[PDB]
From Swiss-Prot:
The keyword Lipid metabolism applies. The record marks W105 as: Essential for stabilizing binding to COTL1. GO terms for biological process: arachidonate metabolic process; dendritic cell migration; glucose homeostasis; humoral immune response; leukocyte chemotaxis involved in inflammatory response; leukocyte migration involved in inflammatory response; leukotriene A4 biosynthetic process; leukotriene biosynthetic process. This is Polyunsaturated fatty acid 5-lipoxygenase. Pathway: Lipid metabolism; leukotriene A4 biosynthesis. Gene3D superfamilies: 3.10.450.60, Lipoxygenase-1, Domain 5, PLAT/LH2 domain.
Amino acid sequence: SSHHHHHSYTVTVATGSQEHAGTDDYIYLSLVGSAGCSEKHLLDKGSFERGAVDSYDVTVDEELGEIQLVRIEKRKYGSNDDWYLKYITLKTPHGDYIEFPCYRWITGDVEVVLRDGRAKLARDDQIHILKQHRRKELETRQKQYRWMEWNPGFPLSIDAKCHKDLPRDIQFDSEKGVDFVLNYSKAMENLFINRFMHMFQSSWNDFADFEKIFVKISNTISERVMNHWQEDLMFGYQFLNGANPVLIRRCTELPEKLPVTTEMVECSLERQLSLEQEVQQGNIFIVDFELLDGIDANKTDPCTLQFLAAPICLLYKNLANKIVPIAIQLNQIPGDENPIFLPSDAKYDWLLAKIWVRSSDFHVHQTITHLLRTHLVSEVFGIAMYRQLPAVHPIFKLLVAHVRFTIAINTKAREQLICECGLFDKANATGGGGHVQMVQRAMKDLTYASLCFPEAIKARGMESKEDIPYYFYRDDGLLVWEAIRTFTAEVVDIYYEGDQVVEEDPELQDFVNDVYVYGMRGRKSSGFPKSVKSREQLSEYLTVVIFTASAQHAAVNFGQYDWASWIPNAPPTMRAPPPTAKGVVTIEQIVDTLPDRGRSCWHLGAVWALSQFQENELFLGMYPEEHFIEKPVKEAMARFRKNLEAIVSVIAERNENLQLPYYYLSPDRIPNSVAI
Ligand SMILES: [Fe+2]
């Protein structure tokens, strides 16, 4: 893979490994020294092939001094062969070895100009050559990466209508590599379900009819779900360790809108305390779907009415310290057509009440927990990073690995999935616009504090491991949060000698300010910082960014097939309204309320496709793109990787004693960024 060209500097040029990384176009290189610039040098005609390392001897007509910049210019040979340049290194006549990180796609359209890889704040740059490069880099970034309002009240996102319109630097490696249209359909073939793809008016004949399809495609967890989804324990388990474990709260007072009494739930209580006494002891929990109240249901199929609820589910920590459901009201305002269902009800009344809660959990999961609170948030940070932090800045070098492919996957989603008449409308009862309404309503509670994982856990009253022992999302989340916090605090400490340097960093300030003003729409109640004035505040902010993009996304994304493939445990839609009376519903009715065959197919393809890892996925703390080249930061990265490996072992030992292992937050399964 290594080609040495001999006719002085030795210039090493490293081409990417991605499929189309290579180029046959003319490549010119110049060196900018403090004492002068070199000539433009055509690097020996030929092809920089995928994965290539080419070395060239380059003799200069004059002494240049310390090399400050390297300039690359791609000129056309034949047609446009985009080029992925990983890095350039220099061995100088004076014997020094200088690395210039790039990690960028180079189209013929503009010269690329690189600093050496030592990280620099603006205050480090005092000579004109460097100040001009830095300022021009930011001017160009701010023309190429612009903010846009895709839907009213949303966090602002990238100003591009489709993926092909993005700057090449932030596109996927290919145009059809990661594609919702192609991958959802590919999923339905691999899952063997393609004959039913568009059968949107046909119910399953019974549970057995769907089981026949499911058993061929189940995995370990989803097979357990199929066998156990009717159990109260399995239903309650998911609020702590399922796909959406972020909603449950410790109840400190029973809400007036839920007129439940001790007599109603006395059979569930196990301590000879009244319900009001259980509340006060900390044994009562609540999941409250107020956000779904008044969301429009999908009306895009006139032959299929679809329906949403907005339930309140009351839960109890029993004598085994397991949290189990004790009461379910399917809508927000109580009354005689909004019954409080109970585990003492007729079998299928209580089962259906639980299905409605699971369906509601799925809706909030897809649109709020996952899309808004990890995808759109991560994209806000990535756009702000590109607009305001030059590539030589240490926070750019730190964060660029954690926003990889984020704008690309979100733009594909707005292009194909969640746009009007996109794929999301096919199976989901919030399709057709209710999902946009939910985002608008959740925005008003997307706060900074809600992204600070320890505080957010405490805000829900769920922090006590002694009182609430089987919350593995919490336990693993806290360890990973602290690992990132430790890593970011060290990086900050290397490059920022004190708080005044943080406060005076104009690019950092503009980064934070773009997130507040554009990303968060300038809402004071968001609690986002308008500026950052200390090293500790910066460390916490960078942890919010990285944790949201890696750990939080992984926890809520990669258990989607596990928990939602068995459709009764997570219906994407319901084809009858919630039951208004006890003693009526039958199992046959439930079958006809659950998704039709077509919606089931699209749902399974979607949760399968979205739960996949890539063959060379980058997991947390894997940084093959060496933006950082300096020894102190590389030692910080090594300590990060060691802290993470210790967490892997903690989780592995914990999981061996568990009925259902919880592994979404094992760091060896957490990708660096939102990329799917
Ligand atoms: Fe995702």
